Amino acid sequence: WYHRLSHLHSRLQD
């Protein structure tokens, strides 16, 4: 699933 990691870390931002 790690190809979607960028999508989670984009939602982590403020």
Coordinates of all heavy atoms in Angstrom, one line a residue:
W1 N 0.8 -1.2 0.0 CA 0.0 0.0 0.0 C 0.9 1.3 0.0 O 0.3 2.4 -0.2 CB -0.9 0.0 1.2 CG -0.3 0.2 2.5 CD1 0.2 -0.8 3.4 CD2 0.1 1.5 3.2 NE1 0.8 -0.2 4.5 CE2 0.7 1.2 4.4 CE3 -0.1 2.8 2.9 CZ2 1.2 2.2 5.3 CZ3 0.4 3.9 3.7 CH2 1.0 3.5 4.9
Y2 N 2.2 1.1 0.2 CA 3.1 2.3 0.4 C 3.1 3.3 -0.7 O 3.7 4.4 -0.6 CB 4.4 1.9 0.9 CG 4.5 1.5 2.3 CD1 4.6 0.2 2.8 CD2 4.4 2.5 3.3 CE1 4.7 -0.1 4.1 CE2 4.5 2.2 4.7 CZ 4.6 0.9 5.1 OH 4.7 0.6 6.4
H3 N 2.5 3.0 -1.9 CA 2.5 4.0 -3.0 C 1.4 5.1 -2.7 O 1.5 6.1 -3.3 CB 2.1 3.2 -4.3 CG 0.8 2.4 -4.2 ND1 0.7 1.3 -3.4 CD2 -0.4 2.7 -4.8 CE1 -0.6 0.9 -3.6 NE2 -1.3 1.7 -4.4
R4 N 0.6 4.8 -1.7 CA -0.4 5.8 -1.3 C 0.1 6.6 -0.1 O -0.6 7.4 0.5 CB -1.7 5.1 -0.9 CG -2.3 4.4 -2.2 CD -3.7 3.9 -1.9 NE -3.8 3.0 -0.8 CZ -4.4 3.3 0.4 NH1 -4.9 4.5 0.7 NH2 -4.4 2.3 1.4
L5 N 1.3 6.3 0.4 CA 1.9 7.0 1.6 C 1.9 8.5 1.4 O 1.7 9.2 2.4 CB 3.3 6.4 1.8 CG 4.0 7.1 3.0 CD1 3.3 6.6 4.3 CD2 5.5 6.7 3.0
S6 N 2.1 9.0 0.2 CA 2.2 10.4 -0.1 C 0.8 11.0 0.1 O 0.7 12.2 0.4 CB 2.6 10.6 -1.6 OG 2.7 12.0 -1.9
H7 N -0.3 10.3 -0.1 CA -1.6 10.8 0.1 C -1.9 11.0 1.6 O -2.6 11.9 2.0 CB -2.6 9.8 -0.5 CG -2.4 9.6 -2.0 ND1 -1.3 9.0 -2.5 CD2 -3.3 10.0 -3.0 CE1 -1.5 9.0 -3.9 NE2 -2.7 9.6 -4.2
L8 N -1.4 10.1 2.5 CA -1.6 10.2 3.9 C -0.7 11.4 4.4 O -1.2 12.2 5.3 CB -1.1 8.9 4.6 CG -2.2 7.8 4.6 CD1 -2.4 7.2 3.2 CD2 -1.7 6.7 5.5
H9 N 0.5 11.5 4.0 CA 1.4 12.5 4.5 C 1.0 13.9 3.9 O 1.5 14.9 4.4 CB 2.9 12.2 4.1 CG 3.4 11.1 5.1 ND1 2.8 9.9 5.4 CD2 4.6 11.2 5.7 CE1 3.6 9.3 6.3 NE2 4.7 10.1 6.5
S10 N 0.2 13.9 2.9 CA -0.4 15.2 2.4 C -1.5 15.7 3.2 O -1.8 16.9 3.3 CB -0.9 15.0 0.9 OG 0.2 14.8 0.1
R11 N -2.2 14.7 3.9 CA -3.3 15.0 4.8 C -2.8 15.3 6.2 O -3.6 15.8 7.1 CB -4.3 13.9 4.8 CG -5.0 13.8 3.4 CD -6.0 12.6 3.4 NE -6.7 12.5 2.1 CZ -7.9 12.9 1.9 NH1 -8.7 13.5 2.9 NH2 -8.5 12.8 0.7
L12 N -1.5 15.0 6.5 CA -0.9 15.2 7.8 C -0.6 16.7 8.0 O -0.5 17.2 9.1 CB 0.4 14.4 7.9 CG 1.2 14.6 9.1 CD1 0.5 14.1 10.4 CD2 2.6 14.0 9.0
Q13 N -0.5 17.4 6.9 CA -0.1 18.8 7.0 C -1.2 19.7 7.6 O -2.3 19.3 7.7 CB 0.2 19.3 5.5 CG 1.2 18.4 4.8 CD 2.5 18.3 5.6 OE1 3.0 19.2 6.3 NE2 3.2 17.1 5.5
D14 N -0.8 20.9 8.1 CA -1.7 21.8 8.7 C -2.6 22.6 7.8 O -3.4 23.4 8.2 CB -0.9 22.7 9.7 CG 0.3 23.3 9.1 OD1 0.6 23.2 7.9 OD2 1.1 23.9 10.0

